[PDB]
Amino acid sequence: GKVYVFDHPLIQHKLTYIRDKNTGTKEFRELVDEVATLMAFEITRDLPLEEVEIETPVSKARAKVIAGKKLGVIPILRAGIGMVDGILKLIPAAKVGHIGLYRDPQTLKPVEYYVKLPSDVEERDFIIVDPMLATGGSAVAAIDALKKRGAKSIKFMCLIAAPEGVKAVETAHPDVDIYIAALDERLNDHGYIVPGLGDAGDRLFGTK
Amino acid sequence: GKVYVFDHPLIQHKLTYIRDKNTGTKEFRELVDEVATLMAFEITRDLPLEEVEIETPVSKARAKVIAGKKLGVIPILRAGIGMVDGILKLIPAAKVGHIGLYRDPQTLKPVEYYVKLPSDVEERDFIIVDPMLATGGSAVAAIDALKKRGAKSIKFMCLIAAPEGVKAVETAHPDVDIYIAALDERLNDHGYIVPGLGDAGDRLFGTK
Ligand SMILES: O=c1ccn([C@@H]2O[C@H](COP(=O)(O)O)[C@@H](O)[C@H]2O)c(=O)[nH]1
Numbered sequence: 266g267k268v269y270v271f272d273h274p275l276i277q278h279k280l281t282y283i284r285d286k287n288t289g290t291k292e293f294r295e296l297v298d299e300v301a302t303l304m305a306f307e308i309t310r311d312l313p314l315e316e317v318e319i320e321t322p323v324s325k326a327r328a329k330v331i332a333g334k335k336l337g338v339i340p341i342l343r344a345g346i347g348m349v350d351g352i353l354k355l356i357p358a359a360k361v362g363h364i365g366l367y368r369d370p371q372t373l374k375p376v377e378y379y380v381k382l383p384s385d386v387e388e389r390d391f392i393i394v395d396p397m398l399a400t401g402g403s404a405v406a407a408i409d410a411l412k413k414r415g416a417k418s419i420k421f422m423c424l425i426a427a428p429e430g431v432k433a434v435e436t437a438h439p440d441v442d443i444y445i446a447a448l449d450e451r452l453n454d455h456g457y458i459v460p461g462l463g464d465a466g467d468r469l470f471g472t473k
Numbered sequence: 474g475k476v477y478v479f480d481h482p483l484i485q486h487k488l489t490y491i492r493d494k495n496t497g498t499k500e501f502r503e504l505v506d507e508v509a510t511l512m513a514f515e516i517t518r519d520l521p522l523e524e525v526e527i528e529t530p531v532s533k534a535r536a537k538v539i540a541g542k543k544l545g546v547i548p549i550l551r552a553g554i555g556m557v558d559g560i561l562k563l564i565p566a567a568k569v570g571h572i573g574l575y576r577d578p579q580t581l582k583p584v585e586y587y588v589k590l591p592s593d594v595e596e597r598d599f600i601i602v603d604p605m606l607a608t609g610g611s612a613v614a615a616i617d618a619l620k621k622r623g624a625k626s627i628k629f630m631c632l633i634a635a636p637e638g639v640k641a642v643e644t645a646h647p648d649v650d651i652y653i654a655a656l657d658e659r660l661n662d663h664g665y666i667v668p669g670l671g672d673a674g675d676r677l678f679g680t681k
């Protein structure tokens with residue numbers, strides 16, 4: 266599918282401090298939440314409009330309201346929770362589901378481990394969120410997880426992504442669009458995005 | 474100058490409930506604040522970017538930060554304060570100035586009455602805010618007020634505006650751009666925008 270880069274100068278600005286190694290855990294946490302809300306605005310620019318008829322204190326009028334559709338925000342444990350409340354600010358109605366993944370010794374990919382979703386799965390559109398899209402491993406497992414439960418609308422959103430990871434998602438799931446804030450250049454032997462921002466989880470929780 | 478209409482479906486959605494006569498003062502207040510923050514995002518999409526060199530926990534990097542410029546938010550008493558904090562959320566650094574206007578018995582236009590601005594006036598760009606742009610009377614008086622103090626960058630932003638009021642501003646100040654969320658059709662004998670939303674001040678403060 267297509268990848269959308271959100272280049273708003275405010276996102277770009279906050280992203281810079283998010284990357285800087287000197288930004289402590291508290292600022293990091295707060296900055297990600299902010300960039301999360303900002304991207305939520307850009308992404309929801311799609312929401313279908315239906316027009317009703319209201320009546321202001323002056324006269325009647327033809328206004329518009331949001332189409333009426335169910336939304337689902339699903340963070341990938343653990344660094345994923347860092348971007349939920351930010352999105353929930355704009356869409357308080359959206360339901361929140363979580364997904365855990367485990368990794369085995371001699372394997373090349375993560376695997377579904379813990380899944381909790383809202384019961385109306387078949388109906389609502391979902392947005393899987395995770396700060397980093399590296400090898401695409403965790404993202405793919407997560408989407409496979411959702412498709413298996415029958416959600417037919419899946420979008421992925423992250424701050425920073427690596428080419429390989431984007432390709433991994435394209436290949437495995439061409440029907441899923443990707444929303445990123447920046448596309449870095451590559452991965453290193455340990456799987457970190459370069460230049461990236463280090464370990465999202467540690468920077469967020471300030472703990473292991 | 475040019476008028477920019479922000480048609481984001483979220484703004485359109487919230488605007489509808491803002492107009493509805495049945496929305497009580499508390500929701501109104503809160504809804505305006507929200508639409509204010511949302512418009513603040515759209516308007517600041519301009520902010521110039523300068524690129525610095527940071528160093529993430531993984532490697533060095535070339536990032537961008539906001540140009541560095543001073544901003545001023547100036548509400549027109551009284552319904553103007555309803556949109557300040559919403560904007561301040563995105564730009565906490567911006568300074569806040571107020572402007573009061575009085576009206577005399579046999580006159581056709583408002584007039585500067587109370588003015589308090591940050592001292593760096595000559596330097597910073599300002600955004601005058603007021604929920605409604607009706608006859609354009611109050612807006613013009615307000616801009617005249619700022620130009621007289623030597624601010625050379627002035628933008629006007631409101632929720633709903635009437636054609637006459639837009640024209641009034643164009644005529645009196647062609648160098649000021651206008652940012653609105655909706656352009657209604659006309660004014661009635663009492664000066665209210667049709668369909669509009671009634672008296673912004675009463676709906677906001679719930680008092681006279
Ligand atoms: O530089 C990186 C790369 C990955 N991850 C995290 O490691 C997990 C594995 O991503 P992936 O390698 O499966 O793409 C994801 O939860 C992601 O947030 C980071 O925190 N920093």
Ligand SMILES: O=c1ccn([C@@H]2O[C@H](COP(=O)(O)O)[C@@H](O)[C@H]2O)c(=O)[nH]1
Binds near residue numbers: 551552604666669673
């Ligand atoms: O329908 C309207 C028209 C105007 N005003 C308020 O009355 C003042 C006068 O605007 P104007 O007639 O000078 O344009 C402004 O502060 C504006 O917010 C309203 O509350 N509702």
